[PDB]
Curated annotation (Swiss-Prot), chain B:
<comment type="subunit">
    <text>Component of the MexAB-OprM multidrug efflux complex, composed of six MexA subunits forming a hexameric tube, binding to a MexB trimer, which interact with the trimeric OprM outer membrane channel protein. The OprM homotrimer forms a 135 Angstroms-long pore. It consists of a beta-barrel, which is probably inserted in the outer membrane, and an alpha-barrel formed by alpha-helices which probably spans the periplasm. In the ground state the periplasmic end is closed, while the outer membrane end opening is 6-8 Angstroms in diameter.</text>
</comment>
<protein>
    <recommendedName>
        <fullName>Outer membrane protein OprM</fullName>
    </recommendedName>
</protein>
<comment type="similarity">
    <text>Belongs to the outer membrane factor (OMF) (TC 1.B.17) family.</text>
</comment>
<comment type="function">
    <text>The outer membrane component of the MexAB-OprM efflux system that confers multidrug resistance. Functions as the major efflux pump for n-hexane and p-xylene efflux. Has been shown in one study to be involved in the active efflux of the autoinducer N-(3-oxododecanoyl) homoserine lactone, thereby playing an indirect role in quorum-sensing; but has been shown in another study not to be involved in efflux of this autoinducer. Over-expression of the pump increases antibiotic and solvent efflux capacities.</text>
</comment>
């Protein structure tokens, strides 16, 4: 818990960390898939201009 | 007699050749339509162009 109790807080201020440890893993998997497909899309964007 | 045989055969030989060139030309036209629509690239247009001539 990272707020002092009984105080005023603004919107968007973090309150607790709930130990992700699974969402971090699937986020790493999704980013690993993204790192392949975005450079494939960029290479196809470069090659589609010359009609290769 | 050999000349008569060549006369009797070369007409049908060039008929088969002209029909083959016609089929290659229709193949090239279909590949060009497929390329200008955007389905396939310039490589499989170029190989059909090669087959044509």
């Amino acid at each position: 818990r990272l707020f002092k109790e009984g105080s005023d807080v603004k919107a968007g201020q973090q309150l607790y960390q709930i130990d992700p440890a699974t969402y971090e893993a699937d986020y790493q998997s999704a980013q690993a898939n993204l790192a392949s497909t975005q450079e494939q899309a960029q290479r196809y964007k470069l090659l589609v201009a010359d009609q290769a | 007699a050999d000349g008569l045989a060549a006369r009797g055969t070369f007409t049908e030989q060039l008929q088969a050749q002209r029909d083959l060139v016609k089929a290659s030309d229709e193949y090239y036209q279909l590949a060009d339509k497929r390329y200008r629509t955007g389905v396939d690239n310039y490589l499989t247009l170029l190989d059909a162009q090669r087959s044509l001539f």
